[PDB]
Design a binder for this molecule. Structure first.
Ligand SMILES: O=C(O)c1ccc(/C=C\c2ccc(O)cc2)cc1
Lengths: 263, 8
């Protein structure tokens, strides 16, 4: 039974705060309507989101603790850090991040996404809204796999993530490959971190392939961002090239990040 | 300028 094991609290965004009755562990209780589920998978027919969350169940990705099936919905019990703030609100309140802090955050996102790919999972909705900051541990967590897919090497022709983080080949041709599309969205994310908002709002900007910097950003960081946002997918860096880039060296540990920037 | 969330 679901109502017996968890104390349900208020909305967080349909996601409710909750506590596991057993050990008072804070959880997030996420409800997904069957009628709205695009892709299904199996383990027992379940939403693909559950499939992907199980395949990645490492503190860099959110942990699915349990799930239930109801007549018209599935209920997902997800880990809830406390205290937490998502990266979107964090950037809104603090503005453009110092590069040392953006380096630590971006590095942790890179490790999390590498974890997803190694487990056969393509997230397809990397953005600041889908990243939680554990404010005490300085650890970041990738959330909301509701737009994801199994990782494959062939072309994708469907997409349901965030359009302003989607790559130009999707805008123009309705096709993309998983890894190079992910690298594009990471370029958008990195620009977002060091400039305080995403660079593109309109399709014409996305396919136009021009990056104007609205804040002081080091030449090394600008180079990495522009590389990630190469118009031609084959021109984009691999994850290894990103993490070997000069800008990415000497990252802070998560705990150092918390003590210098979050406490 | 208006920074905003973007639904998926
Ligand atoms: O996978 C998901 O969809 C998902 C996973 C974990 C959470 C948990 C807490 C939380 C999220 C965003 C906030 O702004 C505040 C709190 C939510 C959603």
């Amino acid at each position: 039974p679901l109502e017996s094991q968890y104390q349900v609290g208020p909305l967080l965004g349909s996601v409710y705060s909750g506590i596991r009755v057993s050990d008072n562990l804070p959880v997030a209780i996420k409800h997904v309507e069957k009628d709205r589920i695009s892709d299904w998978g199996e383990l027992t027919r379940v939403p693909m989101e559950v499939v992907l969350l199980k395949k990645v169940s490492f503190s860099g990705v959110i942990r699915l603790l349990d799930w239930f099936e109801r007549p018209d919905s599935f209920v997902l019990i997800l880990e809830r850090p406390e205290p937490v703030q998502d990266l979107f609100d964090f950037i809104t309140e603090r503005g453009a991040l110092q590069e040392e802090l953006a380096r630590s955050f971006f590095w942790q996102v890179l490790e999390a996404v590498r974890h997803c790919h190694n487990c056969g999972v393509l997230h397809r909705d990397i953005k600041d809204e889908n990243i939680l900051i554990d404010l005490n541990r300085g650890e970041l967590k990738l959330i909301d796999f509701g737009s994801g897919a199994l990782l494959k090497d062939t072309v994708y022709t469907d997409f349901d993530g965030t359009r302003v983080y989607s790559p130009p080949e999707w805008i123009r041709y309705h096709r993309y490959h998983g890894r190079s599309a992910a690298v594009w969205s990471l370029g958008i994310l990195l620009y977002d971190m060091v400039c305080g908002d995403i660079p593109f709002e309109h399709d014409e900007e996305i396919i136009g392939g021009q990056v104007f910097f609205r804040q002081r950003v080091s030449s090394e960081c600008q180079h990495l961002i522009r590389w990630c946002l190469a118009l031609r997918p084959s021109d984009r860096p691999t994850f290894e090239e990103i993490q070997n880039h000069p800008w990415m060296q000497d990252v802070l540990l998560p705990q150092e990040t918390a003590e210098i920037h979050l406490h | 300028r208006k920074r905003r969330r973007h639904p998926s």
